[PDB]
């Protein structure tokens, strides 16, 4: 989806 394309799992947070 279109909200912020993220490249790098380090920038990810669990759902919510």
């Amino acid at each position, epitope marked *: 989806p279109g909200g912020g*394309q993220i*490249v*790098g*799992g380090v920038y990810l947070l669990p759902r919510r």
Partner: antibody
Framework: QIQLVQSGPELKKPGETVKISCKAS????????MHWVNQAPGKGLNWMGW????????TYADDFKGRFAFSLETSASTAYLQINSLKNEDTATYFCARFLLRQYFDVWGAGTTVTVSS | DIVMSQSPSSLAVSAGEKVTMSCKSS????????????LAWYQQKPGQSPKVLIY???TRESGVPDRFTGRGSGTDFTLTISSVQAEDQAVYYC?????????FGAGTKLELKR
């Protein structure tokens, strides 16, 4: 279902520049980052960088920083890769791939070979 | 730039046998909040483009043979093929996507024996 069609083999001479395409189909183009990976004859894969499809902003890897440019045409759901000042070393295949948030490529183009020779 | 070290550069097995290949990163690919390692495994056959087999280090991709298994957490990972077939001949590459730039390993070539 989802597809990425890439332009045909290219034959450029040293110095000239080339530009290739990658057309997405079956999904909302603007929702996924598009990446470029190259591979020289008899070698491994190299991440070249990526283009933010919703924004158009390109990020290049140290090695492909200089004469390489990622382009976009949202209306046509296509991504372009241009290599200026071609050198007898850029001879490679060049794939385009769609990236998911789970951090992996699930769709690739077949690759566009480019030969730099006189 | 995380470095990915694959070994061995080549493996020769006979159909039906089980093979395992390693891949190690210069640093942890684990995100302690999502608690997942962003290492993926791709299969590239001659004249083809790579295709994913595993992501999240140990999650098999939809539609991929169950004899393909990824293991590991942190910096040491492995890909296992339980019963190798003729159509598994190819070079396997691992890729980290924890921190850009995304980096690939050198790959391991799977050759059959008959």
């Amino acid at each position: 279902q989802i597809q990425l069609v890439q332009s045909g083999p290219e034959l450029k001479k040293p110095g000239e520049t080339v530009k290739i395409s990658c057309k997405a189909s079956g999904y909302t183009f603007t929702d996924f980052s598009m990446h470029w990976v190259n591979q020289a004859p008899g070698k491994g894969l190299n991440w070249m960088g990526w283009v933010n499809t919703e924004t158009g902003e390109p990020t290049y890897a140290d090695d492909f920083k200089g004469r390489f440019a990622f382009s976009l045409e949202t209306s046509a759901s296509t991504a372009y890769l241009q290599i200026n000042s071609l050198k007898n070393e850029d001879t490679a295949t060049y794939f385009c791939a769609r990236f998911l948030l789970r951090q992996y490529f699930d769709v690739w183009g077949a690759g566009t070979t480019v030969t730099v020779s006189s | 730039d995380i470095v990915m070290s694959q070994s061995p550069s080549s493996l020769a097995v006979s159909a039906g046998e089980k093979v395992t290949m390693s891949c190690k990163s210069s640093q942890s690919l684990l995100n302690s909040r999502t608690r997942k390692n962003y290492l993926a495994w791709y299969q590239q056959k001659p004249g083809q483009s790579p295709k994913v087999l595993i992501y999240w280090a140990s999650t098999r991709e939809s539609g991929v043979p169950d004899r393909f298994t990824g293991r590991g957490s942190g910096t040491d990972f492995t890909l296992t093929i339980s019963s190798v077939q003729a159509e598994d001949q190819a070079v396997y590459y691992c890729k980290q996507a924890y921190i850009p730039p995304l980096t690939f390993g050198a790959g391991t070539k799977l050759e059959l024996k008959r």
